[PDB]
Symmetry: C2
Subunit: 137 residues, 2 copies
Amino acid sequence: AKEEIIWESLSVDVGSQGNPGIVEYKGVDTKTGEVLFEREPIPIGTNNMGEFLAIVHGLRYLKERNSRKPIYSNSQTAIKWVKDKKAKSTLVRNEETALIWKLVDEAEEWLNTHTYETPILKWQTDKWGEIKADYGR
Amino acid sequence: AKEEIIWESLSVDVGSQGNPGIVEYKGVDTKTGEVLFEREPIPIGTNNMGEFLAIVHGLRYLKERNSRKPIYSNSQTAIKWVKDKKAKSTLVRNEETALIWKLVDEAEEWLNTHTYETPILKWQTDKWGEIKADYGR
DNA sequence: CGCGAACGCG
DNA sequence: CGCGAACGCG
């Protein structure tokens, strides 16, 4: 069904700046923009770990709800990480990063222990504007 | 002393092709081309590990001999690895790669346990022709 | 600015 | 061919 954007979907995005640094994420209804989940800032993470977590949160939220809506992300790498079931982060493992790493590790565990059919789709910023979940400037 | 090439030097190079695969290296007098050391093929290694080993061999040979000749390599990465005292190879550690990894590990150990002043210089192929130590096509 | 995906040489 | 160095996004 050749319609560009699937509006009945979930858009997820990460909020950063200084990287590694504080990270937060959320999931919004693409069509309506309403926020369907959000994670308060985590003092130390990376953009890509935050976005990885946002997509796996998204999967788990939709799964809970039985819903067939796809998820959109503008991140080539977080999408790849989810599809690979492996978050290939370079972030050091130490006391300050323990929390983000625990969440990422558990997110990976989730992926490798559950089935899902949610399409994870690349949001095309250069044609469709900012992702609705953008924090972000 | 602005003379382009230092002919009274040692040129080192690796022989490959299929990578990872069989690797060998040698050290030659740059001016004369005479081979001053050579390592018989190692069934499994990488180009960059082979060249790393060639440079550290070169350092140890010259050091033995008290000699002030520099060493030339055409490899940006092996030169960086030696200068960093860390061979950042992606080669898997398994039974078939154990030997090359043992040699690399011991080469690193050498570097971090000995002093040397041998300049390690980048051979400029695009201006000075093939490195004399080239196997290599 | 960093995070990560994506030329020479043999 | 692989080995390794060296754009979008927030």
